[PDB]
Amino acid sequence: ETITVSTPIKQIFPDDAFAETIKDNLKKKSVTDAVTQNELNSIDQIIANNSDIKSVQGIQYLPNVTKLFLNGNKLTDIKPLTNLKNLGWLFLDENKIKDLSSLKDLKKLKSLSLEHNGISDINGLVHLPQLESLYLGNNKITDITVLSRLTKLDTLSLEDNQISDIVPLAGLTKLQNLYLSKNHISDLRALAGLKNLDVLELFSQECLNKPINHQSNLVVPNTVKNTDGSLVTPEIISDDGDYEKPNVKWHLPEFTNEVSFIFYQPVTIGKAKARFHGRVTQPLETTEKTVNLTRYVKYIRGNAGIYKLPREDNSLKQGTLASHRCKALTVDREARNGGKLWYRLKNIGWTKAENLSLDRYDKMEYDKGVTAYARVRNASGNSVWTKPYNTAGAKHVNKLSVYQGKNMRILREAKTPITTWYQFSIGGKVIGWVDTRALNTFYKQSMEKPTRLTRYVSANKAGESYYKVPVADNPVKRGTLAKYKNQKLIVDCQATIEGQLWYRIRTSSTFIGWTKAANLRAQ
Ligand SMILES: [Tb+3]
Ligand SMILES: [Tb+3]
Ligand SMILES: [Tb+3]
Ligand SMILES: [Tb+3]
Ligand SMILES: [Tb+3]
Ligand SMILES: [Tb+3]
Ligand SMILES: [Tb+3]
Secondary structure: OOOOOOEEHHHHOOOHHHHHHHHHHOOOOOOOOEEOHHHHOOOOOOEOOOOOOOOOOOHHHOOOOOEEEOOOOOOOOOHHHHHOOOOOEEEOOOOOOOOOOOOOOOOOOOEEEOOOOOOOOOHHHHHOOOOOEEEOOOOOOOOOHHHHOOOOOOEEEOOOOOOOOOHHHOOOOOOOEEEOOOOOOOEOHHHOOOOOOOEEEOOOEEEEOOOOOOOOOOEEEOOOEOOOOOEOOOOEEOOOOEEEOOEEEOOOOOOOOEEEEEEEEEEEEOOEEEEEEEEEEEEOOOOOOOOOOOOOOOOOOOOOEEEOOOOOOHHHEEEEOOOOOOOOOOEOOOOOEOOEOEEEEOOOOEEEOOOOOOOOOOOOOOOOOOOEEEEEOOOOOOEEEOOOOOOOOOOOEEEHHHHOOOOEEEOOOEEOOOOEEEEEEEOOEEEEEEEOOOEEEEEEHHHOEEEEEEEEEOOOOOOOEEEOOOOOOHHHEEEEHHHOOOOOEEEEEEEEEOOEEEEEEEOOOOEEEEEEHHHEEOO
16 A cells, blocks of 8 residues: 655654654654655665554555564554565564464564563464564463474574463474573473574473362472473472472471472573573361269069169069168169160169159158057057158057057058058057058948937946947946936947947937947837
């Protein structure tokens, strides 16, 4: 593309600073002056370094430019260069150019410089197979796969980038100048064949591993390889770490963020010396037996069987609880088999919780004091006490036998868990309580059945007396019949005791008492 009629510079080159540079180039006076295409065509070189140039629009009118130095500017676009075929030298350091799709048709390009352009994608360069010098230092490059095509390069610079994989260079045997410092390289095997190197730089590498769990024995494979394939021995290992065969080892007893080692190894490939150095960072029957109770087995059910283990099987019955009936005891090892709770008696076997109780039972459940008369019916085995056996204050009184034969007056009643008790007296004086089944109450009120018969007193029975109850014991004697000698007697009640007939007499006036019918007359 070109202009026909003369035209001013400013009219063609929008970017002032760039117009200015043209002016000087064409030796012109002022940016205003006009120029012809033929004057534009006479331009083959352009040196505009650090010229605060934001754009180069219009440079499409210099079809014969071959050298172009625009280092240290403010460019970001290069679409104008697109058709500048004869371009052979092109420097664009310190700029912000990222779209390279404009360089694909510059097949005569010999040397390219793009240092400090904040580049990361360079797949575009693949169209410049004839390049001889390439500068990409200080960018954000990680993948140099496409450089494998640039087999005419003798000079290549990629330092201060994020490169890790350099296999893409294994074939560039034509290389003489190679800069790879400040990258993430840790393997130089890929460089083993560059026999034509004169300049080689590999210092300050930063290699970051993938995090691993922290340990106290920590072991990390040394992954730094020489051109050879041999492991590079670590110069300086952090945290007092040591180095064995191919592993770097740490003792890290406590815990730390990361660990690391430093490598420094002079290498030579071709006729070039270099220092391969950098750092590698490594990110990192139920029994409740603890109790002691104080219980007293319920006197009753003293036929409670004791077992070895909390189970109800006679084959495991250690015996029978009954020999320990009235003592303060101590359990310990509790339990719960089949749902029911069991107990372990100190030194004694195992029984059920029901069987054992809280304290020395005494509850009589009632103390009445009815009316009756008994006689010891086999004392063999029983005694007489202060208030029913197994009861507060209940002391002792002679054996039951000590009262046999004699008539005992029933004064009271009782009924504790085992049996019913009868307080009693003899000769009027009270004695105590006794198991009612040991006695024979030959007389009970329930035996007093009513009637309505009439009688008088016997002249021969006048000496006989009458009582309060149909029992001829002195303590219940209430008088002598002879007091009624010839009065009318009304027999209202009656009772048959020990086979004899008694009547309860009374005058139409006053109540008399009980007397044997054998002493009266209806006559
Ligand atoms: Tb302008
Ligand atoms: Tb530089
Ligand atoms: Tb540099
Ligand atoms: Tb450098
Ligand atoms: Tb050489
Ligand atoms: Tb040490
Ligand atoms: Tb640390």
